[PDB]
Amino acid sequence: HMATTINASSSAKYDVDVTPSVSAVAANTATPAIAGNLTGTISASYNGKTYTANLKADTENATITAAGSTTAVKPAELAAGVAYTVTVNDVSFNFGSENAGKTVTLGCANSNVKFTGTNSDNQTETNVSTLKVKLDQNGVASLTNVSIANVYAINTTDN
Ligand SMILES: [Cl-]
Ligand SMILES: [Cl-]
Ligand SMILES: [Hg+2]
């Protein structure tokens, strides 16, 4: 509990900074034609530490739509030059038993990112920039979704 070590390392509207990472690759038509693909992760920082988000499903944990459309797009059919919105469902952060019952606010500097879930006052918020949540008895935060708009599928670099 003593403090005898020189240190000098120095630690908004939110205190959990959520950074989604999406990598979409466009399909190519015929060389044999190549299917598109989509992968990614969601990470967060809280009290100087970084966490990786857990998803309820290994597969089918997200949905792609073209901007101004509600039709589901298979990752195999992604095209370049199309602004996509990726919605990731049943996203959780495990902030550990030491953070159990705490209230934290999730946010994101990137205006293309929005949250859907239950806030700390037990109200449903839909497509919001920031969300105040109550961590459960294990320190876990739960979101209905994270959405990322203006996702562009790149021309494959396998050439
Ligand atoms: Cl980001
Ligand atoms: Cl951020
Ligand atoms: Hg962000």
Author numbering: 30 to 40, 48 to 66, 69 to 197
Task: Show passages lifted from the paper.
We determined the atomic resolution structures of all functional domains (I-III from N- to C-termini) present in the three S-layer proteins SlpA_ac, SlpX_ac, and SlpA_amy.
In SlpA_ac_I, the first ~20 N-terminal amino acids are not structured and reach out from the protein. The crystal structures of SlpA from L. acidophilus and L. amylovorus and observed crystal contacts reveal the self-assembly formation. The assembly is propagated in one direction by alternating SlpA_I dimers and SlpA_II dimers and in the other by the pore spanning N terminus of SlpA_I.
